[PDB]
Amino acid sequence: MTTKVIFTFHNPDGSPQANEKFTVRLTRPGMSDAEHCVVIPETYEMVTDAKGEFTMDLESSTSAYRVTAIGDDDEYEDDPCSQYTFTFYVPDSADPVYVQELILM
Amino acid sequence: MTTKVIFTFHNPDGSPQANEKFTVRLTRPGMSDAEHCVVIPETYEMVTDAKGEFTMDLESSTSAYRVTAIGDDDEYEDDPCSQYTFTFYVPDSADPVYVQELILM
Amino acid sequence: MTTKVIFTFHNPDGSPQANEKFTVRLTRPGMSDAEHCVVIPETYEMVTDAKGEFTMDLESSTSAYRVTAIGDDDEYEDDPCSQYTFTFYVPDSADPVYVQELILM
Amino acid sequence: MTTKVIFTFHNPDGSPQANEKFTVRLTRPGMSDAEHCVVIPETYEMVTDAKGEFTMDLESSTSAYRVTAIGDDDEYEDDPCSQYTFTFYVPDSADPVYVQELILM
Amino acid sequence: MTTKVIFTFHNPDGSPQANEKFTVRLTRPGMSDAEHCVVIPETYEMVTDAKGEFTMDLESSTSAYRVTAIGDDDEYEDDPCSQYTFTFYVPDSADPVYVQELILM
Amino acid sequence: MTTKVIFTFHNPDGSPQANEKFTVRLTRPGMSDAEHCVVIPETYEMVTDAKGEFTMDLESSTSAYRVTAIGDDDEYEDDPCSQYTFTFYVPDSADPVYVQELILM
Amino acid sequence: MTTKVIFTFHNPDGSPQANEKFTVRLTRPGMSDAEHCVVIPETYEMVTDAKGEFTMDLESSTSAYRVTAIGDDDEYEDDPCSQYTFTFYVPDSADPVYVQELILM
Amino acid sequence: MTTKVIFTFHNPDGSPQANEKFTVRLTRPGMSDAEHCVVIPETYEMVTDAKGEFTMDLESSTSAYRVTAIGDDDEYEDDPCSQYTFTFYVPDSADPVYVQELILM
Amino acid sequence: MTTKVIFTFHNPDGSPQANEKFTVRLTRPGMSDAEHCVVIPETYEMVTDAKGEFTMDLESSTSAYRVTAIGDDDEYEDDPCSQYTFTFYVPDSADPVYVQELILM
Amino acid sequence: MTTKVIFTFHNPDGSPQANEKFTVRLTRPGMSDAEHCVVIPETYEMVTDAKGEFTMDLESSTSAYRVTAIGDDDEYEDDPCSQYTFTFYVPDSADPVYVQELILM
Amino acid sequence: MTTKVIFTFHNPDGSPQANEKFTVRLTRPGMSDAEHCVVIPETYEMVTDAKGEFTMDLESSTSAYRVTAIGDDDEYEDDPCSQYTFTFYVPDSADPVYVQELILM
Amino acid sequence: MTTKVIFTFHNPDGSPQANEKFTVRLTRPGMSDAEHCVVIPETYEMVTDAKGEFTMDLESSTSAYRVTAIGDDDEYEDDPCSQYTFTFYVPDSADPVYVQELILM
Amino acid sequence: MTTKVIFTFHNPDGSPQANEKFTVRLTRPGMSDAEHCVVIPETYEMVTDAKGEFTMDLESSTSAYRVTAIGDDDEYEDDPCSQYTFTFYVPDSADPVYVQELILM
Amino acid sequence: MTTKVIFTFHNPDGSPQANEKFTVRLTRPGMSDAEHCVVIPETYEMVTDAKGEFTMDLESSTSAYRVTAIGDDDEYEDDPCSQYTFTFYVPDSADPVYVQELILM
Amino acid sequence: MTTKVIFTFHNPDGSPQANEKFTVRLTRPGMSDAEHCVVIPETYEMVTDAKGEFTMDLESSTSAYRVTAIGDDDEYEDDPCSQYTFTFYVPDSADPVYVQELILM
């Protein structure tokens, strides 16, 4: 029930996007194959490192995760933008994984 | 009319979710096969142990049980969240059981 | 016109549900086979014993009995719950009987 | 024009229902076979005896009798209960009779 | 033009219904066979005797007679009961007669 | 043009109905066969005798006669009863006559 | 043009109806056969004699005569009765005549 | 152009109707056969004689004559009676004439 | 163009109708055969003579003449009578003429 | 273009209608055959002579002449009479002429 | 383009209608055959002479001339008469002309 | 582009219509054949001479000329008369011309 | 791109229309064949000379020219006249030109 | 990406239209073939020279150019004229170019 | 995931458009082929150099870039112009690129 989630975040003109706050949280509870069946949503994690990389190894369920790394500003309903969060379903394997995106079809 | 209900609750990034209050209660009364026919609803139980495990052995009926382990906050009808209770029907066997969930179909 | 009505009431996690008040009462009058034709409703009985058992032997009619053993609280029409009474029709035999329930079909 | 009307009234859990007031009255006048043709309604009788038995021998007509043995309480139209009177048509024979009921069909 | 009208009135539980006032009256005038053609209505008679019997011998016409032996109470239109009068058409013979009733068909 | 009109009036339980006022009157004028053609209405006669009999011999016409022997009471239109007058058409013969009634058909 | 009009008026129970005023009058003028053609209406005559008889001999025309012998009382339109006048057309012959009435057809 | 108009007027019960005023008048002017063509209406004549007879001899025209011999009373339009005038067309011959009436057809 | 217009006017019961004023007048102008073509209306003439005769000899035209010999009374439109004028068309011949009337057809 | 217009006017009962004013006038201008084509209307002439005759000789045109010899009275529109004028078209010849009238067709 | 217009005007009973004013005027301008093409309307001329004759010689055009010789009176629109003017189209020839009228067709 | 426009104006009864003002003016500009293509409207000319004649020689175009020789009076729109102007299109030739009119078709 | 625009303006009765102001102006810009493609509108020129002639040589384009030589008066919209300007499209040749008009079709 | 834009502007009657301000500006940005792909609009240039000529060599794109050489006056929306600007699309070649206009189709 | 984005900006009449501020920014986040999958929008860059050239090498994604080099003025919604920004999708190659525009189709 472990799968490291290494990713790269070098965003501007080759620059590696060094230390910056990183956030992730489960959407709704889900059950994996047998041993890891529970998993209510919760949130954690900070920092991005110099190379722009983050890693954890609990993806075994069948629910969806949402990533909201970017910190920005917002106001009274007239700012439906400036936020660039993404979502990705939970992978199920024992190997390095990457991309695995669910952008607008 | 006995069936142990061992379960695992290691929720965050591999962490085993040590001692925490655990609650369970019958929804409506039900009758099992012969010897255990009555069972009005009632509530009990506390603690989760270091490994996040709980066990009892009376599941023989045909009603539904609800689990509400997580303790959280709530207010005047504008908090339809923060609670992550689940439900599971009563299993009928003499062996260890697990998963046995009734999440949204 | 005699039939003992032995029952078991061990409700919580194997516990036998020792002494507690027990109530039963006929709904409407009914007539049995010949010798026991009259039987207007009335109420009686207390105690449940350590094993949670009660016995009497007059079930011969064709009416319905209601059992309301549980003692609880109630208030002004905003408590349509906390009461877990059941009903059972009158059995007709000379032998130990059990279950014989009329829960929601 | 004579027929004894022996009956049994052992109501609670085998108990014989000893002495208690007993009432009966003809509903409307009726005529029997020849010799006993008149019979305007009237009321009489008390006591039930230890065994719960009552006897009289004038049933020969074709009208209906009503029995109202139970004594109870009543109030201003908000007590359509607590009374458990019955009715029975007039039998025509020369022998012991019993049951002969007209409960809700 | 004569016919005795012997009747029996032993009403309660074999009791012969001794002396009590007895009333009878013609409804409307009628004519018999020849010799007795006139008969305007009128009323008479008292007493019932120990055996509850009354006799007279003028029934020859074709009209209706009404019997109102029972004495009772009545009040302002809210007592459409307590009176148990009957009616019988005029018999035509020379012999003892009885029953000859016109109760609700 | 003569016909005696003997009649009997023994009304109560064989009693002959002795002396009592008797009245008769022609309704409308009428003409008989030849010799007795005129006859305007008029009224007369009293007494009934011990046997209850009356006699006269002028019935020859074709009109109607009305008999109102009974004397009674009456008041303001709320007594459409207590009067038992009858009517009979005029017979035409020379012999004793009787009945000859015109009661409600 | 002459025809005697003898009539009889013995009205009550054989009585001959002695002296009483008698009236007759032509309705409208009419003409007979030749010699007696004129005859405007007019009125005359009194008395009836012991036998109740009247005679005159001018009936030859074709009009109608009205007889109003009876004397009575009358008032303001609420007495359409008590008068028993008759009518008869004029006979044409030379012989005694009688009846010759025109009562309601 | 002459025709005597003898008539008889013996009206009551053979009586000849002696002297009484007699009136006649032409309705509208008319012309006869040749010699007597003019004749505007006018009125004349009185008396009836003992026998009730009147005579004149000018009837030759084709108009109508009206006779109004009877003298009577009249008032304000509520007396459309008491007058018994007649009418007759003009006869054309030389001989005694009579009747010749025009009463209601 | 001359035609004498002799006429007779003996009106009442043979009487010759002596001297009385006589009037005649042309209605509208008309033309005769040749020599007498003009003739505007005008009026003249008086007296009737003892025999009731008048004569003139100018009738040759084709118009109408009106004769109004009778003198009478008249008032405000409620006397459409009492005047008995006549009319006659103009005759055309040479001989005595008479009648020649135009009374209502 | 000359034609004498001799006429006669002896109007009353043969009388010649001596001297009286006579009037004539052309209605509308008209043209004759060649030599006399103009003729606007104008009026002239008086007197009638003893014989009632008038003469002139210019009738050659095709228009209408009106003659109004009679002198009379008239008032405010309630006298559409008393005037007896006539009209005649213009004759065309050389000879005595007469009649030649245009009275109502 | 010359044509004398001699005319005669002897109007009354042969009289020649001596000296009187005479008027004529062109209605609207018109053109003749070649040499005389212009001719705007204008008015002239007086006197009629003893014989009633007038002459001029310019009629060559195709327009209409109006003659209004008669002098009369007129007032405010209630005199549509007393004027007897005529009209005539222009003749085209070299010879005496006459009539040539355009009276109402 | 020259054409003399000699005309004659002897209007009254042969009179030559000596000296009088004469007016002419082009309606709208027009173009002739080549050499004379322009010709905006303008007005000129006076006098008529003793014979009533006028002459000019520029008619070569295709427009319309209007002649208004007559001098008269006019007032506020209630004088749609007294003016007798004419119109004529431009002739195209080299010779004397005349008539050439455009009066109402 | 040169074309002389000689014209003649001898307007009145042969008169040559000596010196007078002459105006011309391009309506809208247009392009000729190649070398002379531009030509925005502008205005110039005066004088007409004794013969009434004007000349210039730039007509090569395809637009329209307007000529407004006549000088006149005008006022507030109630003078839609007195101006006799014309228009002509641009000719394209190398030779004398004339007429070339665009008067109302 | 170079193309000289020589043009001629000799506008009035052959005159070369010497020095005058000249303006040109790109309407909207456009891209040429490869090397010259950008070209946002901008404005420049003055003077026209004696011959009325202007030259530049950057026309390579596919957008539209507008020329507004003429200087004039304008006011508040009631002067939609006096300006004679033109437009021309960008030519693509290496040679002298001219005309190349987009006047109203 | 590198592609240099060399461009040329020589805008006016051959001039190279030397140093001027240059701006570019990603519209929305997008993912490239594998290694460069993230790229949230951000903005950077200044200066244009003497030749008008800019270069960077991160275009590997599939989103859109917007270029807003020109600096201008703007005001309250009544200046929907003066800005000449463009857009271009992200190219995917390893070579010099140019044009690659998305101007109005």
Beta strands in chain K (DSSP E): 24-26, 43-44, 64-67, 86-89
Cα distances from N78 to residues N73, N74, O104, in angstroms, run 11, 8, 35
Name which of H63, H66, H65, H98 is nearest H85 in CA terms.
H66
- The reply to whether residue J99 touches residue I34, judged by beta carbons under 8 angstroms, is yes
Do C20 and C67 meet the contact criterion of CB atoms below 8 Å apart?
no
Cα distances from F67 to residues F1, F23, F70, F93, in angstroms, run 20, 6, 9, 20
- The reply to whether residue M44 touches residue N84, judged by beta carbons under 8 angstroms, is no
- Burial classification of residue H84, based on how many CB atoms lie within 10 Å of its CB (0-12 exposed, 13-18 middle, 19 or more buried): middle
- The reply to whether residue K11 touches residue J38, judged by beta carbons under 8 angstroms, is yes
Amino acid identity of M49? Answer: D
Q: Give the whole-angstrom CA distance, residue L80 versus residue H53.
A: 101
Cα distances from J95 to residues D45, J2, J32, J53, J59, in angstroms, run 154, 9, 17, 16, 11
For N49, the 3-state DSSP assignment is: coil
- Partners of K24 in the beta sheet? K44, K67
For L86, the 3-state DSSP assignment is: strand
CA B97, distance to chain mean position in Å, is 12
Q: Give the whole-angstrom CA distance, residue F59 versus residue C60.
A: 86
| Among chain D residues, CA nearest to E81 | D28
Do E11 and E103 meet the contact criterion of CB atoms below 8 Å apart?
no
Q: How was this structure determined?
A: cryo-EM
Cα distances from D61 to residues D27, D88, M56, in angstroms, run 12, 12, 148
Residue J78's domain is classified under what CATH number? 2.60.40
Q: Any idea what DSSP says for residue N37?
A: B
- Counting as contact any 3 or more CB pairs under 8 A, the partners of I are H, J
Q: Is residue L102 part of a domain?
A: no
- Burial classification of residue H8, based on how many CB atoms lie within 10 Å of its CB (0-12 exposed, 13-18 middle, 19 or more buried): middle
Amino acid identity of A104? Answer: L
Cα distances from L79 to residues B65, C53, F59, L74, L82, in angstroms, run 116, 135, 121, 6, 7
Do M40 and M29 meet the contact criterion of CB atoms below 8 Å apart?
yes
Q: Is H78 left (phi over 0), alpha (psi -120 to 50) or beta?
A: alpha
| Among chain I residues, CA nearest to J13 | I58
Q: Give the whole-angstrom CA distance, residue J77 versus residue B97.
A: 134
Amino acid identity of C39? Answer: V
Do O63 and O26 meet the contact criterion of CB atoms below 8 Å apart?
yes
Asked if I touches N (at least 3 Cβ pairs < 8 angstroms), the answer reads no
Six-digit token string for I6: 């002799």
Q: Give the whole-angstrom CA distance, residue L86 versus residue L101.
A: 8
Q: Is residue C103 part of a domain?
A: no
Residue from K38, K43, K65 whose CB has the most chain L CBs within 10 Å, to mutate: K38
- Burial classification of residue N100, based on how many CB atoms lie within 10 Å of its CB (0-12 exposed, 13-18 middle, 19 or more buried): middle
Do I57 and I90 meet the contact criterion of CB atoms below 8 Å apart?
no
Instruction: Collect all residues with Cβ–Cβ distance below 8 Å to C88 and sequence separation of at least 6.
Output: C64, C65, C67, C100, C101, C102
Per CB-CB distance under 8 Å, the chain E contacts of F7 are: 38
Six-digit token string for F39: 């006859």
Cα distances from G84 to residues F36, F87, G73, in angstroms, run 16, 21, 12
Do M2 and M57 meet the contact criterion of CB atoms below 8 Å apart?
yes
Amino acid identity of N72? Answer: D
Q: Is residue E81 part of a domain?
A: yes
Q: Give the whole-angstrom CA distance, residue M14 versus residue L3.
A: 11
**Sheet (strand A24-26) strand order:** A43-44, A24-26, A64-67, A86-89
User: F41 φ, ψ to 5°?
Assistant: -65, 150
Do D25 and D41 meet the contact criterion of CB atoms below 8 Å apart?
yes
**Integer Rg of chain C from CA:** 15
- Counting as contact any 3 or more CB pairs under 8 A, the partners of L are K, M
Q: Is J77 left (phi over 0), alpha (psi -120 to 50) or beta?
A: left
Six-digit token string for F73: 């009471």
Distance from the G8 Cα atom to the nearest Cα atom in chain F, whole angstroms: 7
Q: Give the whole-angstrom CA distance, residue G104 versus residue O58.
A: 135
Six-digit token string for J90: 């213009």
Q: Find where tokens 């009040």 sit.
A: E75
Name which of I5, I104, I66 is nearest H31 in CA terms.
I104
For I65, the 3-state DSSP assignment is: strand
What's the domain count of chain H? 1
The runs of H, that is alpha helices, within N1-105 are none
Instruction: Collect all residues with Cβ–Cβ distance below 8 Å to F34 and sequence separation of at least 6.
Output: G98, G99
**Integer Rg of chain N from CA:** 15
Q: Which residue in M2, M40, M58 is closest to N84 by CB distance?
A: M40
- The reply to whether residue I13 touches residue H58, judged by beta carbons under 8 angstroms, is yes
Q: Give the whole-angstrom CA distance, residue H90 versus residue H2.
A: 11
Q: Give the whole-angstrom CA distance, residue C7 versus residue C22.
A: 12
Q: Any idea what DSSP says for residue J88?
A: E
Do B52 and B98 meet the contact criterion of CB atoms below 8 Å apart?
no
Per CB-CB distance under 8 Å, the chain D contacts of E11 are: 38-40, 42
| The 3-state secondary structure of M22-77, one letter per residue | CCEEECCCCECCCCCECCCCCEECCCCCCCCCCCCCCCCCCCEEEECCCCCCCCCC
Six-digit token string for O70: 């020109």
Name which of M38, M58, M42, M41 is nearest N7 in CA terms.
M38
Name which of L16, L18, L1, L6 is nearest L55 in CA terms.
L6
Per CB-CB distance under 8 Å, the chain G contacts of H9 are: 38
Q: Give the whole-angstrom CA distance, residue N68 versus residue N24.
A: 6
Cα distances from M68 to residues D35, M24, M81, M86, N26, in angstroms, run 147, 6, 13, 7, 39
The domain of M13 spans 1-91
CA E61, distance to chain mean position in Å, is 14
Q: Which residue in K8, K13, K14 is closest to J38 by CB distance?
A: K8
Q: Is residue I39 part of a domain?
A: yes
Per CB-CB distance under 8 Å, the chain G contacts of F57 are: 13-14
Q: Give the whole-angstrom CA distance, residue G14 versus residue C45.
A: 103
Do N31 and N39 meet the contact criterion of CB atoms below 8 Å apart?
yes
Cα distances from L48 to residues K39, L55, L59, L70, in angstroms, run 15, 10, 19, 11
Q: Is residue D101 part of a domain?
A: no
Q: Is residue D6 part of a domain?
A: yes
- The reply to whether residue B58 touches residue C14, judged by beta carbons under 8 angstroms, is yes
Paired sense of beta strands G43-44 and G64-67, if any: unpaired
Six-digit token string for M85: 């300007």
Dihedral angle, C-alpha E5, E9, E14, E18, nearest 10 °: -110
User: N82 φ, ψ to 5°?
Assistant: 70, -5
Six-digit token string for J33: 């055959």
Q: Give the whole-angstrom CA distance, residue E9 versus residue E69.
A: 10
Dihedral angle, C-alpha E58, E60, E65, E69, nearest 10 °: 30
**Sheet (strand J64-67) strand order:** J43-44, J24-26, J64-67, J86-89
- Burial classification of residue L103, based on how many CB atoms lie within 10 Å of its CB (0-12 exposed, 13-18 middle, 19 or more buried): middle
Six-digit token string for G17: 């109806």
Name which of J95, J8, J2 is nearest J49 in CA terms.
J8
Q: Find where tokens 């022998």 sit.
A: D95
- The reply to whether residue C37 touches residue D10, judged by beta carbons under 8 angstroms, is no
Do C103 and B30 meet the contact criterion of CB atoms below 8 Å apart?
yes
Q: Is residue K103 part of a domain?
A: no
CA H68, distance to chain mean position in Å, is 7
Six-digit token string for I68: 């109004």
Q: Any idea what DSSP says for residue E94?
A: S
Please give the resolution of this entry in Å, rounded to 1 decimal.
4.7
Instruction: Collect all residues with Cβ–Cβ distance below 8 Å to O90 and sequence separation of at least 6.
Output: O30, O32, O59, O60, O61, O62, O63, O64, O65
Name which of L55, L48, L52 is nearest L15 in CA terms.
L52
Report angle CA A58, A64, A68 to the nearest 5 degrees: 90
For chain G, the straight-line distance linking the first and the last C-alpha, in angstroms and rounded, comes to 29
Asked if B touches O (at least 3 Cβ pairs < 8 angstroms), the answer reads no
Amino acid identity of F19? Answer: N
Q: Give the whole-angstrom CA distance, residue G52 versus residue G15.
A: 10
Q: Find where tokens 């006038």 sit.
A: J25
Q: Give the whole-angstrom CA distance, residue J104 versus residue I4.
A: 28
Do E36 and E2 meet the contact criterion of CB atoms below 8 Å apart?
no
Report angle CA B85, B90, B95 to the nearest 5 degrees: 115
Q: Give the whole-angstrom CA distance, residue J19 versus residue J7.
A: 14
Q: Give the whole-angstrom CA distance, residue M87 versus residue M65.
A: 6
Q: Give the whole-angstrom CA distance, residue N24 versus residue E63.
A: 134
Q: Give the whole-angstrom CA distance, residue M68 versus residue M43.
A: 11
- Counting as contact any 3 or more CB pairs under 8 A, the partners of M are L, N
Dihedral angle, C-alpha K36, K41, K43, K49, nearest 10 °: 50
Tell me the residue length of chain I: 105
